Symmetry: none
Subunit: 261 residues, 2 copies
Protein backbone atom coordinates (compact mmCIF):
# COMPACT_ATOMS: atom_id res chain seq x y z
CA UNK A 1 0.00 0.00 0.00
CA UNK A 2 1.65 3.23 -1.25
CA UNK A 3 -0.78 5.21 0.94
CA UNK A 4 -0.01 3.72 4.35
CA UNK A 5 1.19 7.25 5.10
CA UNK A 6 -0.80 10.12 3.59
CA UNK A 7 -1.74 13.73 4.35
CA UNK A 8 -5.48 13.98 5.07
CA UNK A 9 -5.73 16.89 2.62
CA UNK A 10 -4.53 14.49 -0.09
CA UNK A 11 -6.57 11.50 1.11
CA UNK A 12 -9.83 13.40 0.56
CA UNK A 13 -8.89 14.08 -3.08
CA UNK A 14 -8.76 10.42 -4.10
CA UNK A 15 -12.11 10.25 -5.91
CA UNK A 16 -11.82 13.76 -7.39
CA UNK A 17 -10.42 15.20 -10.63
CA UNK A 18 -8.10 18.19 -10.24
CA UNK A 19 -9.24 21.02 -12.53
CA UNK A 20 -6.91 23.78 -13.69
CA UNK A 21 -8.07 27.29 -12.65
CA UNK A 22 -7.84 28.50 -16.25
CA UNK A 23 -10.68 26.11 -17.14
CA UNK A 24 -13.20 27.69 -14.74
CA UNK A 25 -15.08 31.00 -14.88
CA UNK A 26 -17.23 32.23 -12.00
CA UNK A 27 -19.98 34.50 -13.41
CA UNK A 28 -22.26 35.44 -10.50
CA UNK A 29 -23.10 34.49 -6.93
CA UNK A 30 -26.25 32.37 -6.60
CA UNK A 31 -26.01 31.41 -2.93
CA UNK A 32 -24.22 31.99 0.36
CA UNK A 33 -18.92 27.94 5.04
CA UNK A 34 -18.72 30.05 1.87
CA UNK A 35 -20.31 31.05 -1.42
CA UNK A 36 -21.95 29.36 -4.38
CA UNK A 37 -21.43 30.73 -7.90
CA UNK A 38 -22.93 29.99 -11.27
CA UNK A 39 -20.10 29.48 -13.76
CA UNK A 40 -18.74 27.77 -16.88
CA UNK A 41 -16.32 24.87 -17.17
CA UNK A 42 -14.13 24.24 -20.20
CA UNK A 43 -13.72 20.45 -20.50
CA UNK A 44 -18.11 24.37 -22.25
CA UNK A 45 -20.73 23.38 -19.68
CA UNK A 46 -22.58 25.43 -17.04
CA UNK A 47 -21.60 24.50 -13.48
CA UNK A 48 -22.18 25.34 -9.84
CA UNK A 49 -19.03 26.41 -7.98
CA UNK A 50 -18.65 26.27 -4.19
CA UNK A 51 -15.86 28.18 -2.45
CA UNK A 52 -14.62 28.17 1.15
CA UNK A 53 -14.92 31.34 3.26
CA UNK A 54 -11.68 33.29 3.92
CA UNK A 55 -9.82 32.48 7.14
CA UNK A 56 -10.54 28.74 7.17
CA UNK A 57 -8.39 26.35 9.25
CA UNK A 58 -6.71 23.23 7.84
CA UNK A 59 -9.44 21.09 9.41
CA UNK A 60 -12.12 23.10 7.61
CA UNK A 61 -10.15 22.80 4.40
CA UNK A 62 -10.06 19.00 4.75
CA UNK A 63 -13.80 18.86 5.56
CA UNK A 64 -14.54 21.11 2.54
CA UNK A 65 -12.55 19.05 0.05
CA UNK A 66 -13.84 15.85 1.65
CA UNK A 67 -17.34 16.81 0.50
CA UNK A 68 -16.07 16.61 -3.06
CA UNK A 69 -14.29 13.36 -2.20
CA UNK A 70 -17.56 11.81 -1.04
CA UNK A 71 -19.49 13.05 -4.07
CA UNK A 72 -16.84 11.73 -6.45
CA UNK A 73 -17.29 8.16 -5.20
CA UNK A 74 -20.83 8.13 -6.60
CA UNK A 75 -22.29 7.73 -10.06
CA UNK A 76 -26.07 7.68 -10.29
CA UNK A 77 -28.86 9.54 -12.08
CA UNK A 78 -30.24 10.87 -8.78
CA UNK A 79 -26.95 11.89 -7.13
CA UNK A 80 -25.36 15.25 -8.04
CA UNK A 81 -22.36 14.91 -10.40
CA UNK A 82 -18.93 16.19 -9.37
CA UNK A 83 -16.99 17.76 -12.25
CA UNK A 84 -13.88 18.25 -10.16
CA UNK A 85 -12.05 20.44 -7.68
CA UNK A 86 -9.48 23.18 -7.58
CA UNK A 87 -7.37 22.34 -4.53
CA UNK A 88 -3.85 23.35 -5.57
CA UNK A 89 -4.81 27.04 -5.85
CA UNK A 90 -6.73 29.73 -4.03
CA UNK A 91 -9.56 30.19 -3.89
CA UNK A 92 -10.39 26.49 -3.71
CA UNK A 93 -13.49 25.33 -5.58
CA UNK A 94 -15.82 22.35 -5.79
CA UNK A 95 -17.34 22.21 -9.26
CA UNK A 96 -20.60 20.32 -9.77
CA UNK A 97 -23.19 20.04 -12.52
CA UNK A 98 -25.61 22.97 -12.73
CA UNK A 99 -29.21 22.35 -11.65
CA UNK A 100 -31.59 24.92 -13.13
CA UNK A 101 -34.39 24.73 -10.57
CA UNK A 102 -32.26 24.99 -7.42
CA UNK A 103 -33.11 23.48 -4.01
CA UNK A 104 -36.25 21.31 -3.85
CA UNK A 105 -37.85 23.00 -0.83
CA UNK A 106 -37.51 26.51 -2.29
CA UNK A 107 -38.68 25.25 -5.70
CA UNK A 108 -41.89 23.73 -4.29
CA UNK A 109 -42.67 26.90 -2.34
CA UNK A 110 -42.36 29.01 -5.49
CA UNK A 111 -44.40 26.57 -7.60
CA UNK A 112 -46.93 25.84 -4.84
CA UNK A 113 -49.96 23.90 -6.07
CA UNK A 114 -48.56 23.75 -9.62
CA UNK A 115 -47.72 20.06 -9.94
CA UNK A 116 -49.84 16.98 -10.46
CA UNK A 117 -49.78 14.17 -7.90
CA UNK A 118 -47.96 12.05 -10.49
CA UNK A 119 -45.20 14.67 -10.89
CA UNK A 120 -44.75 14.95 -7.11
CA UNK A 121 -44.59 11.15 -6.73
CA UNK A 122 -42.08 11.09 -9.60
CA UNK A 123 -39.81 13.45 -7.66
CA UNK A 124 -40.11 11.26 -4.58
CA UNK A 125 -39.31 8.18 -6.66
CA UNK A 126 -36.07 9.75 -7.93
CA UNK A 127 -34.99 10.72 -4.43
CA UNK A 128 -35.78 7.18 -3.27
CA UNK A 129 -33.76 5.72 -6.18
CA UNK A 130 -30.84 7.94 -5.16
CA UNK A 131 -31.07 6.84 -1.53
CA UNK A 132 -31.34 3.15 -2.52
CA UNK A 133 -28.09 3.62 -4.42
CA UNK A 134 -26.43 5.21 -1.35
CA UNK A 135 -27.76 2.49 0.98
CA UNK A 136 -26.40 -0.17 -1.40
CA UNK A 137 -23.00 1.62 -1.25
CA UNK A 138 -23.28 1.33 2.54
CA UNK A 139 -23.52 5.12 2.79
CA UNK A 140 -25.61 6.52 5.63
CA UNK A 141 -26.48 10.12 4.79
CA UNK A 142 -27.74 11.62 8.10
CA UNK A 143 -28.99 14.89 6.53
CA UNK A 144 -31.68 13.90 4.05
CA UNK A 145 -34.00 16.91 3.71
CA UNK A 146 -35.64 18.74 0.79
CA UNK A 147 -33.11 21.57 1.22
CA UNK A 148 -30.34 19.07 0.32
CA UNK A 149 -32.00 17.93 -2.90
CA UNK A 150 -31.48 19.79 -6.20
CA UNK A 151 -33.90 19.84 -9.15
CA UNK A 152 -33.06 20.21 -12.86
CA UNK A 153 -35.29 21.39 -15.71
CA UNK A 154 -36.79 17.92 -16.28
CA UNK A 155 -37.80 17.80 -12.57
CA UNK A 156 -35.13 15.18 -11.87
CA UNK A 157 -34.26 15.39 -8.17
CA UNK A 158 -30.72 14.68 -6.98
CA UNK A 159 -29.24 14.26 -3.52
CA UNK A 160 -26.71 17.08 -3.57
CA UNK A 161 -25.28 17.75 -0.11
CA UNK A 162 -23.08 15.36 1.82
CA UNK A 163 -23.18 17.15 17.72
CA UNK A 164 -25.60 19.52 16.04
CA UNK A 165 -28.18 17.48 14.12
CA UNK A 166 -31.13 18.40 11.85
CA UNK A 167 -33.61 17.61 14.60
CA UNK A 168 -36.87 17.88 12.57
CA UNK A 169 -35.58 15.32 10.03
CA UNK A 170 -33.83 12.88 12.37
CA UNK A 171 -35.17 9.49 13.65
CA UNK A 172 -35.84 9.20 17.43
CA UNK A 173 -33.08 6.59 18.00
CA UNK A 174 -30.61 8.89 16.22
CA UNK A 175 -31.56 11.96 18.26
CA UNK A 176 -31.43 9.96 21.51
CA UNK A 177 -28.55 7.55 20.93
CA UNK A 178 -26.71 8.85 17.84
CA UNK A 179 -27.75 5.58 16.21
CA UNK A 180 -27.61 6.46 12.50
CA UNK A 181 -28.38 3.74 9.96
CA UNK A 182 -30.08 3.48 6.58
CA UNK A 183 -33.27 2.97 8.58
CA UNK A 184 -32.87 6.41 10.15
CA UNK A 185 -32.37 7.78 6.61
CA UNK A 186 -35.71 6.12 5.81
CA UNK A 187 -37.32 8.15 8.61
CA UNK A 188 -35.82 11.28 7.05
CA UNK A 189 -37.17 10.19 3.65
CA UNK A 190 -40.64 10.10 5.20
CA UNK A 191 -40.16 13.70 6.30
CA UNK A 192 -39.03 14.62 2.77
CA UNK A 193 -42.21 13.02 1.35
CA UNK A 194 -44.18 15.29 3.68
CA UNK A 195 -42.16 18.35 2.64
CA UNK A 196 -42.87 17.51 -0.99
CA UNK A 197 -46.60 16.84 -0.60
CA UNK A 198 -47.14 20.05 1.42
CA UNK A 199 -45.13 22.07 -1.14
CA UNK A 200 -42.31 22.96 1.26
CA UNK A 201 -43.98 23.47 4.62
CA UNK A 202 -41.52 23.24 7.51
CA UNK A 203 -41.87 19.86 9.28
CA UNK A 204 -43.81 20.31 12.56
CA UNK A 205 -44.63 23.91 11.61
CA UNK A 206 -43.61 26.47 14.26
CA UNK A 207 -43.04 23.84 16.98
CA UNK A 208 -39.58 24.19 18.56
CA UNK A 209 -36.92 21.48 18.26
CA UNK A 210 -37.59 20.49 21.89
CA UNK A 211 -41.34 20.16 21.27
CA UNK A 212 -40.57 18.00 18.23
CA UNK A 213 -38.22 15.71 20.18
CA UNK A 214 -40.87 15.24 22.85
CA UNK A 215 -43.72 14.87 20.34
CA UNK A 216 -42.17 12.06 18.31
CA UNK A 217 -41.29 10.02 21.42
CA UNK A 218 -44.90 10.56 22.57
CA UNK A 219 -45.99 8.96 19.30
CA UNK A 220 -47.03 12.13 17.47
CA UNK A 221 -46.71 11.91 13.69
CA UNK A 222 -47.20 14.57 11.04
CA UNK A 223 -50.80 14.52 9.70
CA UNK A 224 -51.71 13.85 6.08
CA UNK A 225 -51.01 16.73 3.70
CA UNK A 226 -53.98 18.17 1.77
CA UNK A 227 -54.75 16.25 -1.44
CA UNK A 228 -52.27 13.56 -0.53
CA UNK A 229 -53.34 10.07 -1.73
CA UNK A 230 -53.82 7.73 1.22
CA UNK A 231 -51.27 5.21 -0.09
CA UNK A 232 -48.67 7.99 -0.08
CA UNK A 233 -49.48 8.97 3.51
CA UNK A 234 -49.48 5.31 4.57
CA UNK A 235 -45.94 4.97 3.20
CA UNK A 236 -44.92 8.07 5.18
CA UNK A 237 -46.34 6.44 8.30
CA UNK A 238 -44.34 3.26 7.61
CA UNK A 239 -41.14 5.33 7.31
CA UNK A 240 -41.94 6.80 10.73
CA UNK A 241 -42.32 3.53 12.66
CA UNK A 242 -40.76 4.01 16.11
CA UNK A 243 -39.04 0.62 15.84
CA UNK A 244 -36.51 1.12 13.08
CA UNK A 245 -36.59 -2.57 12.04
CA UNK A 246 -40.23 -2.10 11.03
CA UNK A 247 -39.51 0.72 8.55
CA UNK A 248 -39.38 -0.30 4.90
CA UNK A 249 -35.97 -0.45 3.22
CA UNK A 250 -35.20 1.94 0.34
CA UNK A 251 -35.54 -0.90 -2.19
CA UNK A 252 -39.03 -1.52 -0.77
CA UNK A 253 -39.84 2.18 -1.05
CA UNK A 254 -38.78 2.33 -4.72
CA UNK A 255 -40.98 -0.69 -5.52
CA UNK A 256 -43.96 0.76 -3.65
CA UNK A 257 -43.72 4.11 -5.47
CA UNK A 258 -43.31 2.37 -8.86
CA UNK A 259 -46.56 0.42 -8.35
CA UNK A 260 -48.31 3.71 -7.51
CA UNK A 261 -47.10 5.29 -10.76
CA UNK B 1 -7.83 -33.76 -22.98
CA UNK B 2 -5.40 -31.06 -21.73
CA UNK B 3 -6.66 -31.60 -18.16
CA UNK B 4 -5.89 -35.32 -17.75
CA UNK B 5 -3.46 -34.09 -15.10
CA UNK B 6 -4.62 -31.16 -12.96
CA UNK B 7 -4.13 -29.79 -9.45
CA UNK B 8 -7.40 -30.07 -7.49
CA UNK B 9 -7.07 -26.41 -6.46
CA UNK B 10 -7.22 -25.52 -10.18
CA UNK B 11 -9.94 -28.06 -11.06
CA UNK B 12 -12.35 -26.36 -8.65
CA UNK B 13 -11.87 -22.99 -10.39
CA UNK B 14 -13.12 -24.16 -13.78
CA UNK B 15 -16.59 -22.59 -13.60
CA UNK B 16 -15.39 -19.44 -11.79
CA UNK B 17 -14.16 -16.04 -12.98
CA UNK B 18 -10.95 -14.85 -11.31
CA UNK B 19 -11.41 -11.33 -9.91
CA UNK B 20 -8.53 -8.93 -9.30
CA UNK B 21 -8.24 -7.82 -5.63
CA UNK B 22 -8.22 -4.17 -6.72
CA UNK B 23 -11.82 -4.62 -7.90
CA UNK B 24 -13.23 -5.63 -4.50
CA UNK B 25 -13.82 -3.57 -1.36
CA UNK B 26 -14.97 -5.22 1.87
CA UNK B 27 -16.96 -2.66 3.92
CA UNK B 28 -18.24 -4.47 7.04
CA UNK B 29 -18.81 -7.93 8.51
CA UNK B 30 -22.38 -9.23 8.21
CA UNK B 31 -21.90 -12.77 9.50
CA UNK B 32 -19.39 -15.38 10.70
CA UNK B 33 -15.35 -21.71 8.14
CA UNK B 34 -14.78 -17.94 8.05
CA UNK B 35 -16.47 -14.56 7.70
CA UNK B 36 -19.02 -12.93 5.44
CA UNK B 37 -18.67 -9.27 4.46
CA UNK B 38 -20.86 -6.78 2.68
CA UNK B 39 -18.83 -5.10 -0.06
CA UNK B 40 -18.64 -3.48 -3.50
CA UNK B 41 -17.45 -4.95 -6.78
CA UNK B 42 -16.15 -2.91 -9.69
CA UNK B 43 -16.96 -4.83 -12.90
CA UNK B 44 -20.15 -0.99 -9.26
CA UNK B 45 -22.47 -3.48 -7.59
CA UNK B 46 -23.06 -4.47 -3.96
CA UNK B 47 -21.87 -8.01 -3.19
CA UNK B 48 -21.51 -10.55 -0.40
CA UNK B 49 -17.94 -11.68 0.24
CA UNK B 50 -16.98 -14.94 1.96
CA UNK B 51 -13.47 -15.46 3.32
CA UNK B 52 -11.73 -18.54 4.74
CA UNK B 53 -10.61 -18.52 8.39
CA UNK B 54 -6.85 -18.11 9.04
CA UNK B 55 -4.82 -21.32 9.32
CA UNK B 56 -6.74 -23.42 6.79
CA UNK B 57 -5.24 -26.61 5.30
CA UNK B 58 -4.95 -27.22 1.55
CA UNK B 59 -7.93 -29.59 1.73
CA UNK B 60 -10.01 -26.81 3.29
CA UNK B 61 -8.83 -24.40 0.63
CA UNK B 62 -9.95 -26.81 -2.12
CA UNK B 63 -13.34 -27.35 -0.40
CA UNK B 64 -13.78 -23.56 0.02
CA UNK B 65 -13.04 -22.73 -3.61
CA UNK B 66 -15.05 -25.76 -4.74
CA UNK B 67 -18.15 -24.10 -3.30
CA UNK B 68 -17.62 -21.29 -5.78
CA UNK B 69 -16.96 -23.90 -8.48
CA UNK B 70 -20.32 -25.55 -7.86
CA UNK B 71 -22.22 -22.26 -7.77
CA UNK B 72 -20.54 -21.15 -10.98
CA UNK B 73 -21.99 -24.08 -12.94
CA UNK B 74 -25.49 -22.75 -12.35
CA UNK B 75 -27.59 -20.02 -13.94
CA UNK B 76 -31.15 -19.64 -12.71
CA UNK B 77 -33.39 -16.98 -11.18
CA UNK B 78 -33.66 -18.98 -7.92
CA UNK B 79 -29.98 -19.96 -7.46
CA UNK B 80 -27.53 -17.42 -5.98
CA UNK B 81 -25.26 -15.82 -8.60
CA UNK B 82 -21.49 -16.13 -8.33
CA UNK B 83 -19.68 -12.95 -9.38
CA UNK B 84 -16.28 -14.57 -9.06
CA UNK B 85 -13.41 -15.51 -6.78
CA UNK B 86 -10.07 -14.23 -5.59
CA UNK B 87 -7.92 -17.37 -5.42
CA UNK B 88 -4.47 -16.13 -6.46
CA UNK B 89 -4.13 -13.82 -3.44
CA UNK B 90 -4.69 -13.76 0.31
CA UNK B 91 -7.19 -13.45 1.71
CA UNK B 92 -9.17 -15.61 -0.73
CA UNK B 93 -12.75 -14.52 -1.41
CA UNK B 94 -15.95 -15.89 -2.90
CA UNK B 95 -17.98 -12.99 -4.27
CA UNK B 96 -21.72 -13.41 -4.77
CA UNK B 97 -24.67 -11.13 -5.48
CA UNK B 98 -25.97 -9.25 -2.44
CA UNK B 99 -29.34 -10.32 -1.02
CA UNK B 100 -30.93 -7.56 1.04
CA UNK B 101 -33.13 -9.66 3.32
CA UNK B 102 -30.55 -12.27 4.36
CA UNK B 103 -31.32 -15.89 5.33
CA UNK B 104 -34.93 -17.04 4.93
CA UNK B 105 -35.32 -18.56 8.40
CA UNK B 106 -34.00 -15.43 10.14
CA UNK B 107 -36.12 -13.23 7.85
CA UNK B 108 -39.38 -15.06 8.60
CA UNK B 109 -38.71 -14.94 12.35
CA UNK B 110 -38.26 -11.16 12.18
CA UNK B 111 -41.35 -10.62 9.99
CA UNK B 112 -43.46 -13.21 11.85
CA UNK B 113 -47.11 -13.08 10.81
CA UNK B 114 -46.42 -10.26 8.33
CA UNK B 115 -46.98 -12.03 4.99
CA UNK B 116 -50.06 -13.23 3.18
CA UNK B 117 -50.49 -16.92 2.36
CA UNK B 118 -49.96 -16.00 -1.31
CA UNK B 119 -46.60 -14.37 -0.54
CA UNK B 120 -45.47 -17.39 1.50
CA UNK B 121 -46.54 -19.81 -1.24
CA UNK B 122 -44.73 -17.60 -3.76
CA UNK B 123 -41.50 -18.03 -1.77
CA UNK B 124 -41.96 -21.79 -1.74
CA UNK B 125 -42.63 -21.73 -5.48
CA UNK B 126 -39.32 -19.99 -6.17
CA UNK B 127 -37.42 -22.41 -3.97
CA UNK B 128 -39.13 -25.31 -5.78
CA UNK B 129 -38.24 -23.79 -9.16
CA UNK B 130 -34.62 -23.56 -8.03
CA UNK B 131 -34.60 -27.17 -6.89
CA UNK B 132 -36.25 -28.35 -10.13
CA UNK B 133 -33.37 -26.69 -11.99
CA UNK B 134 -30.80 -28.42 -9.75
CA UNK B 135 -32.55 -31.80 -10.10
CA UNK B 136 -32.60 -31.38 -13.89
CA UNK B 137 -28.83 -30.66 -13.72
CA UNK B 138 -28.55 -34.00 -11.87
CA UNK B 139 -27.44 -32.11 -8.76
CA UNK B 140 -28.42 -33.59 -5.39
CA UNK B 141 -28.17 -30.85 -2.76
CA UNK B 142 -28.30 -32.76 0.58
CA UNK B 143 -28.63 -29.60 2.75
CA UNK B 144 -31.86 -27.91 1.70
CA UNK B 145 -33.05 -25.90 4.69
CA UNK B 146 -34.44 -22.38 5.19
CA UNK B 147 -31.06 -21.30 6.59
CA UNK B 148 -29.51 -22.04 3.17
CA UNK B 149 -31.97 -19.89 1.24
CA UNK B 150 -31.38 -16.14 0.76
CA UNK B 151 -34.08 -13.52 0.15
CA UNK B 152 -33.83 -10.27 -1.84
CA UNK B 153 -36.01 -7.14 -1.64
CA UNK B 154 -38.69 -8.47 -4.03
CA UNK B 155 -38.93 -11.58 -1.78
CA UNK B 156 -37.24 -13.76 -4.39
CA UNK B 157 -35.76 -16.78 -2.61
CA UNK B 158 -32.54 -18.36 -3.89
CA UNK B 159 -30.74 -21.56 -2.94
CA UNK B 160 -27.48 -20.09 -1.76
CA UNK B 161 -25.33 -22.66 0.02
CA UNK B 162 -23.75 -25.66 -1.64
CA UNK B 163 -20.38 -37.85 8.32
CA UNK B 164 -22.35 -35.13 10.05
CA UNK B 165 -25.72 -34.54 8.41
CA UNK B 166 -28.53 -31.99 9.00
CA UNK B 167 -30.64 -34.58 10.78
CA UNK B 168 -33.90 -32.58 11.15
CA UNK B 169 -34.03 -31.93 7.39
CA UNK B 170 -32.85 -35.32 6.12
CA UNK B 171 -34.97 -38.15 4.63
CA UNK B 172 -35.09 -41.42 6.64
CA UNK B 173 -33.31 -43.50 3.94
CA UNK B 174 -30.54 -40.88 3.82
CA UNK B 175 -30.05 -40.85 7.59
CA UNK B 176 -30.08 -44.67 7.72
CA UNK B 177 -28.27 -45.64 4.51
CA UNK B 178 -26.65 -42.46 3.18
CA UNK B 179 -29.00 -42.85 0.21
CA UNK B 180 -29.18 -39.27 -1.11
CA UNK B 181 -31.25 -38.61 -4.23
CA UNK B 182 -33.46 -35.83 -5.57
CA UNK B 183 -36.25 -37.63 -3.72
CA UNK B 184 -34.46 -37.09 -0.41
CA UNK B 185 -34.13 -33.41 -1.38
CA UNK B 186 -37.91 -33.47 -1.85
CA UNK B 187 -38.24 -34.62 1.76
CA UNK B 188 -36.06 -31.67 2.80
CA UNK B 189 -38.26 -29.37 0.70
CA UNK B 190 -41.27 -30.54 2.71
CA UNK B 191 -39.42 -29.52 5.87
CA UNK B 192 -38.66 -26.12 4.30
CA UNK B 193 -42.37 -25.61 3.52
CA UNK B 194 -43.03 -26.25 7.20
CA UNK B 195 -40.29 -23.79 8.22
CA UNK B 196 -41.85 -21.15 5.98
CA UNK B 197 -45.47 -21.66 7.05
CA UNK B 198 -44.56 -21.60 10.77
CA UNK B 199 -42.44 -18.45 10.22
CA UNK B 200 -39.11 -20.07 11.12
CA UNK B 201 -39.91 -22.53 13.90
CA UNK B 202 -37.24 -25.20 14.32
CA UNK B 203 -38.43 -28.51 12.77
CA UNK B 204 -39.51 -30.89 15.57
CA UNK B 205 -39.25 -28.10 18.16
CA UNK B 206 -36.99 -28.96 21.12
CA UNK B 207 -36.89 -32.70 20.32
CA UNK B 208 -33.31 -34.00 20.12
CA UNK B 209 -31.79 -35.37 16.89
CA UNK B 210 -32.15 -38.90 18.32
CA UNK B 211 -35.85 -38.40 19.11
CA UNK B 212 -36.34 -37.07 15.58
CA UNK B 213 -34.63 -40.10 14.00
CA UNK B 214 -36.79 -42.46 16.00
CA UNK B 215 -39.96 -40.40 15.48
CA UNK B 216 -39.82 -40.28 11.69
CA UNK B 217 -39.18 -44.03 11.41
CA UNK B 218 -42.13 -44.55 13.80
CA UNK B 219 -44.27 -42.69 11.27
CA UNK B 220 -44.44 -39.35 13.09
CA UNK B 221 -44.87 -36.32 10.82
CA UNK B 222 -44.85 -32.63 11.68
CA UNK B 223 -48.41 -31.34 12.24
CA UNK B 224 -50.08 -28.66 10.12
CA UNK B 225 -48.85 -25.13 10.83
CA UNK B 226 -51.43 -22.60 12.04
CA UNK B 227 -53.32 -20.93 9.17
CA UNK B 228 -51.79 -23.32 6.69
CA UNK B 229 -54.13 -24.14 3.77
CA UNK B 230 -54.90 -27.86 3.75
CA UNK B 231 -53.62 -28.25 0.17
CA UNK B 232 -50.25 -26.86 1.32
CA UNK B 233 -50.10 -29.30 4.24
CA UNK B 234 -51.17 -32.20 2.01
CA UNK B 235 -48.25 -31.41 -0.29
CA UNK B 236 -45.91 -31.38 2.73
CA UNK B 237 -47.24 -34.81 3.67
CA UNK B 238 -46.59 -36.09 0.14
CA UNK B 239 -42.97 -34.87 0.35
CA UNK B 240 -42.65 -36.88 3.58
CA UNK B 241 -43.75 -40.28 2.22
CA UNK B 242 -41.58 -42.98 3.80
CA UNK B 243 -41.22 -44.73 0.41
CA UNK B 244 -39.14 -42.24 -1.54
CA UNK B 245 -40.62 -43.37 -4.89
CA UNK B 246 -44.02 -42.12 -3.70
CA UNK B 247 -42.82 -38.53 -3.14
CA UNK B 248 -43.63 -36.01 -5.86
CA UNK B 249 -40.76 -34.88 -8.09
CA UNK B 250 -39.77 -31.20 -8.09
CA UNK B 251 -41.47 -30.65 -11.48
CA UNK B 252 -44.67 -32.01 -9.87
CA UNK B 253 -44.22 -29.67 -6.89
CA UNK B 254 -43.78 -26.61 -9.13
CA UNK B 255 -46.97 -27.49 -11.04
CA UNK B 256 -48.93 -28.13 -7.85
CA UNK B 257 -47.86 -24.78 -6.34
CA UNK B 258 -48.64 -22.93 -9.59
CA UNK B 259 -52.24 -24.21 -9.59
CA UNK B 260 -52.64 -23.04 -5.99
CA UNK B 261 -51.45 -19.54 -6.91
Amino acid sequence: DPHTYEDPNQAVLKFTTEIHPSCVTRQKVIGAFGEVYKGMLKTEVPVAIKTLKAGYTEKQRVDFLGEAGIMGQFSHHNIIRLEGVISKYKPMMIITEYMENGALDKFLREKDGEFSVLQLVGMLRGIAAGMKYLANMNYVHRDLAARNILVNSNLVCKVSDFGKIPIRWTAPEAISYRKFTSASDVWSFGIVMWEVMTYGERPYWELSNHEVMKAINDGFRLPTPMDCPSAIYQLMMQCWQQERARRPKFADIVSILDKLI
